[PDB]
Design a protein around this ligand. Structure first.
Ligand SMILES: [C]C1=C(SC2=[C][C]=[C]C(O[C@]3(F)FC4=C(C([N])=O)[C][C]=[C]N4[C]4O[C]([C]OP([O])(=O)OP([O])(=O)O[C][C]5O[C](N6[C]=NC7=C6N=[C]N=C7[N])[C](OP([O])([O])=O)[C]5[O])[C]([O])[C@]4([O])F3)=[C]2)SC2=C1C([N])=NC([N])=N2
Length: 186
């Protein structure tokens, strides 16, 4: 198994969701960016693994679940089995990352992408080790009910460039946004 990564889109007031939906109107190219960065492996014959909480799973549109060409793992302590369409179920972030140690997965998985939500991000981000955050800055405030945890810029270095990631400002539906990549190693 290769690199551990989080990916998120976040408004200026740190919002990531409202009532199980995006706070902003759908941004097609932003979702395409998410799909491209989480799907692309750097190693032939492997897939990347996406880890998400239960509410995140159910927040993804049905026609896009499971996230195609990725192994999908959902976190829950209530569920008895993976939801319809999902591939794996774990009871904790550690359990899920341990699972990728199992032999028949440890040779299948390249990158691990935590794709939401708030609590899963927060534990990964405060856990020692090497971790990258792919953050889309949506450059307006939006009413939200779920927020991205604080990024400690003492530990998370903003990279000045990253291959495959546009550096200029994007705009869709009159909403400006920009891509960033942060890296810590502690
Ligand atoms: C993913 C993505 C995309 S696609 C989409 C579409 C539509 C919608 C969505 O979503 C959203 F809005 F978004 C957000 C995001 C961003 N912005 O980015 C991401 C994700 C998600 N989101 C949102 O937010 C929210 C969710 O929430 P919360 O609350 O935070 O949740 P979760 O975490 O998921 O859940 C909870 C549950 O689960 C479980 N858990 C958790 N954790 C854990 C667990 N278990 C065990 N362990 C652990 N550790 C629990 O359960 P139980 O069963 O146990 O009880 C809990 O409860 C909402 O609102 C949503 O929506 F949001 C999406 S586009 C994009 C993306 C990304 N990622 N990135 C980018 N850039 N873009």
């Amino acid at each position: 198994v290769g690199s551990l990564n989080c990916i998120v889109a976040v408004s200026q007031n740190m919002g990531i969701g409202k009532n199980g939906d995006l706070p902003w109107p759908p941004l097609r190219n932003e979702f395409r960016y998410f799909q491209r960065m989480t799907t692309t492996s750097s190693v032939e014959g492997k897939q990347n693994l996406v880890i998400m909480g239960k509410k995140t799973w159910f927040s993804i549109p049905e026609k896009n679940r499971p996230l195609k060409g990725r192994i999908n793992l959902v976190l829950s302590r209530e569920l008895k089995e993976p939801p319809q369409g999902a591939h794996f179920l774990s009871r904790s972030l550690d359990d899920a990352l341990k699972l990728t140690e199992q032999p028949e997965l440890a040779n299948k998985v390249d990158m691990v992408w935590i794709v939401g939500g708030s609590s899963v991000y927060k534990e990964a981000m405060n856990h020692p080790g090497h971790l990258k955050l792919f953050v889309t800055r949506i450059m307006q405030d939006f009413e939200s009910d779920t927020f991205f945890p604080e990024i400690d810029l003492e530990k998370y270095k903003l990279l000045p460039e990253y291959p495959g990631v546009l550096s200029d400002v994007q705009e869709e539906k009159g909403i400006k946004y920009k891509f960033e990549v942060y890296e810590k190693n502690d």
